[PDB]
Amino acid sequence: DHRELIGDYSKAFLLQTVDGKHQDLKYISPETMVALLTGKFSNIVDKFVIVDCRYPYEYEGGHIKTAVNLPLERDAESFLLKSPIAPCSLDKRVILIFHSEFSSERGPRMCRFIRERDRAVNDYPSLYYPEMYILKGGYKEFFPQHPNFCEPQDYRPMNHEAFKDELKTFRLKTRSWA
Ligand SMILES: N#Cc1ccc(O)cc1F
């Protein structure tokens, strides 16, 4: 493999990656996301979690099948790290995939946060989630490519004109803002 090792330096990244703006994070294409969902890697990948970092109204308007909605850092931390999601075989992998609407801000932010927390609760260099990816282009790019991998088959942007109140309501539940 022509890249660096995963975060606990145990092995190479399994998935092919594409360029993304956060140069130190690994991005995957919609096609690769589908390869996971269709079990192309089932001999090796025991579990993968799709972490939809968008707000609940966005998720409710259409999300990737099997995805979990964890927009608040405190909830992502509880869900992922209170009782870590472990493979059922020592030989097999657990992978996290983070995304948001464009995977420009919210997805990458959550990915970095989880790494920070994972490091904090382990003896270096061990990690619960050494292998994490960002879905390039987020839900906005995924839905038009693979609508039957989504439910409902629709797309509700964060800035949807009918959801301005819902955006504000959610923001007021966050731990920090500028
Ligand atoms: N932060 C962070 C972080 C998350 C995943 C990764 O592969 C590398 C990183 F620096």
From Swiss-Prot:
Signal peptide: none annotated. Phosphorylated by BRSK1 in vitro. Phosphorylated by CHEK1, which inhibits the activity of this protein. It is found in: Cytoplasm, Cytoskeleton, Microtubule organizing center, Centrosome; Cytoplasm, Cytoskeleton, Spindle pole. Residues 44-151 form the Rhodanese domain. The active site is at 100. It comes from the Eukaryota. The modification Phosphoserine is found at residues 83, 176. Tyrosine protein phosphatase which functions as a dosage-dependent inducer of mitotic progression. Directly dephosphorylates CDK1 and stimulates its kinase activity. Required for G2/M phases of the cell cycle progression and abscission during cytokinesis in a ECT2-dependent manner. The three isoforms seem to have a different level of activity. Interacts with MAPK14 and 14-3-3 proteins. Belongs to the MPI phosphatase family. This is M-phase inducer phosphatase 2. It comes from Homo sapiens (Human). The chain holds residues 388 to 565 of 580 of the full protein.
